[PDB]
Coordinates of C-alpha atoms and ligand atoms in Angstrom, one line a residue:
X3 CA 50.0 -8.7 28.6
X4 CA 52.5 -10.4 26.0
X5 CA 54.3 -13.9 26.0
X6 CA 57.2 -14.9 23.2
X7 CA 57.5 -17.9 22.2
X8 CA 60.0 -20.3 20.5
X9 CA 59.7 -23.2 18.8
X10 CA 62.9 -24.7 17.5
X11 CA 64.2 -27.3 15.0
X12 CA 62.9 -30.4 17.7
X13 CA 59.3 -30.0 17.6
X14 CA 59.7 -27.9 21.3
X15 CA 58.0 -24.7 22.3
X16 CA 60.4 -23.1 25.0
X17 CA 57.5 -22.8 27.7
X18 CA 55.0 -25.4 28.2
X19 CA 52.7 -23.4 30.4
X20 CA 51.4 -19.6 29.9
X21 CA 49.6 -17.1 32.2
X22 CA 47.7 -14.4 31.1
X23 CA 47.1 -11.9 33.7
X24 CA 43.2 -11.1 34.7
X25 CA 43.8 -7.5 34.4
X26 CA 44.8 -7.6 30.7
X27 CA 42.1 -6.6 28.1
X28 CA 44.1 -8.0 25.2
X29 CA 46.9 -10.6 25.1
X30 CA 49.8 -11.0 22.4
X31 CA 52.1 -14.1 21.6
X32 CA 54.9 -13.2 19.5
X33 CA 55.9 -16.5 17.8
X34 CA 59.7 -17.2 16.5
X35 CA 61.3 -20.4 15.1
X36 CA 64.9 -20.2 16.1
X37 CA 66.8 -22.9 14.2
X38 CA 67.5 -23.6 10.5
X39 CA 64.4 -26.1 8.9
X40 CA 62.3 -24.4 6.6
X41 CA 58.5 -24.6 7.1
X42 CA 57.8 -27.5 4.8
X43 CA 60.2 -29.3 7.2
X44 CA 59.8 -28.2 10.6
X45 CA 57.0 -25.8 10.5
X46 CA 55.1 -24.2 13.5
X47 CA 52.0 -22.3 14.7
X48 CA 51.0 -21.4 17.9
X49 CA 47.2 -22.0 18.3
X50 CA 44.6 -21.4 21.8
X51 CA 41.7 -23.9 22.4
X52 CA 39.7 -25.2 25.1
X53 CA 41.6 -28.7 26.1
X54 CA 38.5 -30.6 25.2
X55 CA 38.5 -29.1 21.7
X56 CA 42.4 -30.0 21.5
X57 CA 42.2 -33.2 19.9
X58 CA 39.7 -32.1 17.4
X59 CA 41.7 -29.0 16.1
X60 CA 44.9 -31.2 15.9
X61 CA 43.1 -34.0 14.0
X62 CA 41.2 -32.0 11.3
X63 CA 44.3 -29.4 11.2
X64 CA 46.4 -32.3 10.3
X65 CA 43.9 -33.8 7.8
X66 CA 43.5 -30.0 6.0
X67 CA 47.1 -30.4 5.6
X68 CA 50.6 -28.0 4.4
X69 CA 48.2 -26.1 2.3
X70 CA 45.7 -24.6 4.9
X71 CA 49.0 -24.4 7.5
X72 CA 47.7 -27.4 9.5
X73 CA 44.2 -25.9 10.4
X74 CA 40.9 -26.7 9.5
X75 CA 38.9 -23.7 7.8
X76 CA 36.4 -21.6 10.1
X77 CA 37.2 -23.4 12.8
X78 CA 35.2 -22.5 15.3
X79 CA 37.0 -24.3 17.9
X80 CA 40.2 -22.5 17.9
X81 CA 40.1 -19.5 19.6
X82 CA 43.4 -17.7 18.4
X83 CA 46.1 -18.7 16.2
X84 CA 49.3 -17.4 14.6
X85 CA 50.0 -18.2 10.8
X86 CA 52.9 -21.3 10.4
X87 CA 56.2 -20.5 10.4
X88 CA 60.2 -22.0 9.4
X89 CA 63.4 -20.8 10.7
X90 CA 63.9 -17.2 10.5
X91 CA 59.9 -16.2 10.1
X92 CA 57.7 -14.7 13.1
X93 CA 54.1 -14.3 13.5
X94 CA 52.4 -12.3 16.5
X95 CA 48.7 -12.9 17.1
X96 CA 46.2 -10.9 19.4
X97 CA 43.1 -11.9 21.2
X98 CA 40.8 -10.3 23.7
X99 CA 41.4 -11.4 27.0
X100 CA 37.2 -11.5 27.4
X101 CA 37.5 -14.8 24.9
X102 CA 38.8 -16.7 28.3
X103 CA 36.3 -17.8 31.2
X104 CA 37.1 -19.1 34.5
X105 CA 37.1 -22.5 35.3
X106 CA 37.5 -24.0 32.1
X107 CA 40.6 -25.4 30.6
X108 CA 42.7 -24.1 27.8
X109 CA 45.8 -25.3 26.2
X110 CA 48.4 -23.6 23.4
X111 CA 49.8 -26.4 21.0
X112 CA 51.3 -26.3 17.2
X113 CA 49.3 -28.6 15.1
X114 CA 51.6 -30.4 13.1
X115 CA 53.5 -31.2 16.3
X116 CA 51.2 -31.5 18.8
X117 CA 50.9 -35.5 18.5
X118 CA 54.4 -35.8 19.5
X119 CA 53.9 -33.1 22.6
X120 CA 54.3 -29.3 21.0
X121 CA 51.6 -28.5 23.4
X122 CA 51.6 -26.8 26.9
X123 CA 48.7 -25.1 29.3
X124 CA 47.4 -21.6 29.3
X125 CA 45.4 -20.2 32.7
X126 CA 44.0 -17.1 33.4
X127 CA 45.5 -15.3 36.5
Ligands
CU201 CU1 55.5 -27.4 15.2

């Protein structure tokens, strides 16, 4: 019921597709940054959404910029998300596994590096 995950000094996360077991009530990504950038180089978060609600996240997470660690306030679209982190930091975050419905489509994705493909799938199994 737990997942780490890297992202390194490339703007890639070391899986690109995550299952979370059916069975699991909660579900924890521990998030490290192996590598040597700093966050106001080569920062990253790891953040849960529906796939149609990807875009939107990315775009006004983006727009809210460094100082709000790429995400848009109360956004209601994102469904879990670690803090952003540079080389050397780590953030875990914890959601209930009841937050995830079958049949619909999710995907993980850091926000300042999702446009050029920090992004990858997450199904329920
Ligand atoms: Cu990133």
């Amino acid at each position: 019921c737990s997942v780490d995950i890297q992202g390194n000094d490339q703007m890639q996360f070391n899986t690109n597709a995550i299952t979370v077991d059916k069975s699991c009530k909660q579900f924890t990504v521990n998030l490290s940054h192996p590598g040597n950038l700093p966050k106001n180089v080569m920062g990253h978060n790891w953040v849960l959404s529906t796939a149609a609600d990807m875009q939107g996240v990315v775009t006004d997470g983006m727009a809210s910029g460094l100082d709000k660690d790429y995400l848009k306030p109360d956004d209601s679209r994102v469904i879990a998300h670690t803090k952003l982190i540079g080389s050397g930091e780590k953030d875990s975050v914890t959601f209930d596994v009841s937050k995830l419905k079958e049949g619909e489509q999710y995907m993980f994705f850091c926000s300042p590096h999702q446009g050029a493909g920090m992004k990858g799938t997450l199904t329920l199994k």
